[PDB]
Amino acid sequence: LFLWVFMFVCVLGTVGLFLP
Amino acid sequence: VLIGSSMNLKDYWESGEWAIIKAPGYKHDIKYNCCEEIYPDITYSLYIRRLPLFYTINLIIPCLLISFLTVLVFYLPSDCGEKVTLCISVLLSLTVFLLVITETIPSTSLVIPLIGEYLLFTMIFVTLSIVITVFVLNVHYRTPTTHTMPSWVKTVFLNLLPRVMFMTR
Amino acid sequence: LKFRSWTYDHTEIDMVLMTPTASMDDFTPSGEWDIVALPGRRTVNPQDPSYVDVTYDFIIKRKPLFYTINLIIPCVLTTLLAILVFYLPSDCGEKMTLCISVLLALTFFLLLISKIVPPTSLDVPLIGKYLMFTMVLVTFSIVTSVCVLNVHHRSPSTHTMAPWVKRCFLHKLPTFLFMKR
Amino acid sequence: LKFRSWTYDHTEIDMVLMTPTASMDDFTPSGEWDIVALPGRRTVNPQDPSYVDVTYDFIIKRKPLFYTINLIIPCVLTTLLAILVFYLPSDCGEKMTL
Amino acid sequence: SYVDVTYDFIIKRKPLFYTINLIIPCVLTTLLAILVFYLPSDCGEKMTLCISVLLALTFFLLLISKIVPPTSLDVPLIGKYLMFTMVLVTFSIVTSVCVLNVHHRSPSTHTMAPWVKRCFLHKLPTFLFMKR
Numbered sequence A: 001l002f003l004w005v006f007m008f009v010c011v012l013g014t015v016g017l018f019l020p
Numbered sequence B: 001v002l003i004g005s006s007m008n009l010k011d012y013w014e015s016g017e018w019a020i021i022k023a024p025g026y027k028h029d030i031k032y033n034c035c036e037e038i039y040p041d042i043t044y045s046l047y048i049r050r051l052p053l054f055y056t057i058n059l060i061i062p063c064l065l066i067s068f069l070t071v072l073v074f075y076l077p078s079d080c081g082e083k084v085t086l087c088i089s090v091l092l093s094l095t096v097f098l099l100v101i102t103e104t105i106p107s108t109s110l111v112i113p114l115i116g117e118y119l120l121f122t123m124i125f126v127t128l129s130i131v132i133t134v135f136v137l138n139v140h141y142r143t144p145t146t147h148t149m150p151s152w153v154k155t156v157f158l159n160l161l162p163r164v165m166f167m168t169r
Numbered sequence C: 001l002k003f004r005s006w007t008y009d010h011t012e013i014d015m016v017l018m019t020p021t022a023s024m025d026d027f028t029p030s031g032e033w034d035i036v037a038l039p040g041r042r043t044v045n046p047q048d049p050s051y052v053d054v055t056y057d058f059i060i061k062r063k064p065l066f067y068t069i070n071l072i073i074p075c076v077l078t079t080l081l082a083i084l085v086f087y088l089p090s091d092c093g094e095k096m097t098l099c100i101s102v103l104l105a106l107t108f109f110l111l112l113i114s115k116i117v118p119p120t121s122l123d124v125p126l127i128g129k130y131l132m133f134t135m136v137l138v139t140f141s142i143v144t145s146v147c148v149l150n151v152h153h154r155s156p157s158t159h160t161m162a163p164w165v166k167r168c169f170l171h172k173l174p175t176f177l178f179m180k181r
Numbered sequence D: 001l002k003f004r005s006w007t008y009d010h011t012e013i014d015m016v017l018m019t020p021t022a023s024m025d026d027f028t029p030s031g032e033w034d035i036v037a038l039p040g041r042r043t044v045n046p047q048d049p050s051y052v053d054v055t056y057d058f059i060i061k062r063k064p065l066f067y068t069i070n071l072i073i074p075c076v077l078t079t080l081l082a083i084l085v086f087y088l089p090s091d092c093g094e095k096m097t098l
Numbered sequence E: 001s002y003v004d005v006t007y008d009f010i011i012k013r014k015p016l017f018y019t020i021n022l023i024i025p026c027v028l029t030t031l032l033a034i035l036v037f038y039l040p041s042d043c044g045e046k047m048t049l050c051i052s053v054l055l056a057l058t059f060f061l062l063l064i065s066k067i068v069p070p071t072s073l074d075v076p077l078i079g080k081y082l083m084f085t086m087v088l089v090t091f092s093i094v095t096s097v098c099v100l101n102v103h104h105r106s107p108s109t110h111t112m113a114p115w116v117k118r119c120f121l122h123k124l125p126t127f128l129f130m131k132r
């Protein structure tokens, strides 16, 4: 459960930071 | 007008680190884009070589000696608990040597050194080695009370491959 | 670059920029940086006499392959190694070593990237912010790994399994996460 | 900053402060510090002649973000793991490591 | 048209600083280099001691490569000595892994060959004073 949660949070973090 | 044809190395105090092979001098008559007239100049060209014994005994032999340890993990049994510590240690030691080699060289982005390319190569493959060894540690500690063993793994990873690798149970 | 004189002023000398762009004639290429344009302008303030100025702007691109091949690849490497301590089983005893080592490597690259950067507080670079995010994520990974390693070593003689973990973590969630015993 | 003249003294020259503050008409902001006040004052000692002085005080405030991103987040980060070694079991031998 | 006058300061060094601060931890870790083989293989601590001794030797090698001048004309005895001991520790690591692998062999995976039956049980234990 925490594997999937932290994977999803890390993907959204990389997208939200390197959007430009 | 040049007097000789080379730089004088008659009063040359020896260096001990760089050895001069040859140092010629050449006269040119060039024309700049500021000004409508010709200006002369004299160009000397030192051609030196590094004597490679201080760095091959303190930066290359330990680097090669720890880069020959990234493949030695896979002969160590999973019943022991030391498959990771070795990988983490060689990864951090290659990171420290990468710090040393980016301390020594300039930051010219024209070409890359062969030693830094070799360090990057070995770091990539040791990271792939830890992502393989976490998978084989997850495969090892696995019981029939928590997981069911499939059917295609009974033929491929247990009968087809040990006949090739010369294991034969 | 701001060229002006300290003795005389606008009431005694002019200062006429001849060409609009600085010339690029005897330029040797630097190898690390790239000059892309070199404009130049002449700044005078109306309703403020005795002011002359000729400024040249240098806009400089970087050849980025050095810092890429030496810092971006280990950055994404040690970030990719951070969602990886959860696939390792807790029956072995090598989880906390991996977690502490990933956090150690992230703090090492953060203190390294804080050296090549200038010490200004206009804005942090994206590498430092990215490593700060991943470092906070690895710290939450450490505390949830210790919490998930405590429930692995619970014996029946010292603990009693409550009915709510029976109804939650055995029936609904092993079907929600495709486990199925 | 203590301005004084080595050659002359108060029996030869006075030293009068013109404006009470220092002028910020050519200042470029450094991006690392913030000046907030630059007062100046004239200092003279009664019962001790031949002493002029003009002292400028620079009262500065630091941009707090660069040391927060580098020496506060790992400081408040590795402190949280100190009381975390007691919830770990003593069966998996990883308490001494942490 | 060539004369000069040269003085030749020949100086001996007081060695008591670098003897205590560098020679003693060097010979200490060198004394620890031959020590990982008496540890039993059942406890999972063979690799930690080997890697720790190797990393301490690389630390002292990179420390001694800083106070020395960077001349390739000759290398000191300490650098050659630490390189020799580092090669010895790396061979200790590879033979420690290869002797740790033969500790965890079971009958459900491997099968004991007759030559390792007759060699490592009769000749060498009576040769190395083991006596079962």
Ligand SMILES: *[C@@H]1O[C@H](CO)[C@@H](O[C@@H]2O[C@H](CO)[C@@H](O[C@@H]3O[C@H](CO[C@H]4O[C@H](CO)[C@@H](O)[C@H](O)[C@@H]4O)[C@@H](O)[C@H](O[C@H]4O[C@H](CO)[C@@H](O)[C@H](O)[C@@H]4O)[C@@H]3O)[C@H](O)[C@H]2NC(C)=O)[C@H](O)[C@H]1NC(C)=O
Residues within 6 Å of the ligand: B026, B027, B028, B029, B043, B045, B047
């Ligand atoms: C390290 O880096 C430096 C600079 O990058 C290199 O220096 C260059 O070396 C080359 C090779 O020697 C030089 O080229 C030579 O220039 C001489 C001077 O030129 C004058 O004379 C000619 C002929 O009249 C005029 O046209 C010119 O305007 C000058 O007035 C020439 O005399 C040389 O010619 C001789 O060699 C050629 C073959 O190469 C023969 O065919 C000719 O007949 C003649 O015998 C030659 O052309 C060059 O000038 C150097 N650069 C500078 C700036 O001086 C180093 O070579 C390099 N190190 C190494 C090891 O490569």
Ligand code: NA
Residues within 6 Å of the ligand: B081, B085, C093, C094, C097
């Ligand atoms: Na361990």
